[model samples]
Target: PLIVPYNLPLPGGVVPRMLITILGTVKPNANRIALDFQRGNDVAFHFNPRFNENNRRVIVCNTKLDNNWGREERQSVFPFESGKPFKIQVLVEPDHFKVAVNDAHLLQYNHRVKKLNEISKLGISGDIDLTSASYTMI
Candidate 1:
């Protein structure tokens, strides 16, 4: 599939050395994808440098791909286009940071905290309008 608007032009803009996004289905014919902005350096999840209005990081998963087997992100999925507004949820579990976008699917990125089991806190920042969000653990 063709992904239009390859490099998304967000309102607040992306910060340098922050956020690694991915896109594509990788089956050649089905090349749908999303952005994975928080990888490398032994890190997987990411939040803006600060939780404020200027910077925004939201992961919107397509409702259709809710039950699909989500895979690990790679360099090939670099640029993708969601085509419309979506929802993203960031959860810091004891073993990983579970990211669920649009309530469709979830992706796990290991937490970088010293205490592996110390799961606490999640911050949301951005100017994008959120359709819905959960304050409880998923």
Candidate 2:
């Protein structure tokens, strides 16, 4: 079901990071599934700055590894239950942006925005019944 839309543009003291992922099986451990960003206005930012900023990220579901990141756990790189689609990368750096999905295997969390022309504009939504979602800005 997933759909996508984006008009990505970045310049001026850059720092943008995105790594929204879903490797399907539709909620393996069932965290209810989330990774939504409608920034610049539409206000829906959760879990501030872990990799990015303000509205940042770091999610891992299935085989249980979101154990508050204390240590001693690192073995669930997106178990997978579908075919190629859950890939998102918008890593623009000078200050931020480092989303690595499919390149590594599911590890998301990092977003920072100070100026950058108020992000210019971007669009990538979620849910979509869970299949594959896409958004990329380099």
Candidate 3:
């Protein structure tokens, strides 16, 4: 039994040329999982992967401002599988974020929250076995 909706503070917050790594395993019966980069009540980036009972996989990415969600960006290149482990890396670029899964380039998201230093929290939840989460600067 693992806790859902776990959150951690981003020490000095995010900045350009940084890398955030998250390692976790999807539960056998998982239907959804998500990670959110937050500043106060607003969400800078939201990464959500969905798993259906039919074995279909989909991922949706977006940003939220003042309780309102922006447009959704959906991806079909899913690297997540039920009961499998995943290593995801998010590279903070000067103007956007680049994502990689299992060591391969995935996608890029533009900065909706321009103030990178203010994105001070990381929230993770859903049916997942969160093994390790950390960051590095390069």
> How are the candidates ranked when ordered by lDDT, highest leading?
3, 2, 1
Q: Any runs in candidate 2 off by more than 4 Å, and if so which?
A: 6-83, 89-94, 103-114, 124-138
For residues 1-138, write the lDDT of model 2, one tens digit per residue: 444332233332233444333333332322223333333443222211122123333343211122222222222334322222444444544454444555653343333334544444443333224454434443
Task: Tell me each candidate's TM-score.
Answer: 0.34, 0.25, 0.92
Q: Candidate 1: where are CA atoms >4 Å away? A: 1-83, 115-121
Candidate 2 global lDDT: 0.35
TM-score for candidate 1, please give it.
Answer: 0.34
After superposing all C-alphas onto the true structure, candidate 1 shows an RMSD in angstroms of 15.0
Model 2: per-residue Cα lDDT at residue 117: 41
Per-residue lDDT tens digits for candidate 3, residues 22-134, read 88888898899988999999999999988873567888999999899999998988888889998889999998989999999988999989989999999988888988887
Better of 1 and 2 by lDDT: 2
lDDT of each: 0.32, 0.35, 0.88
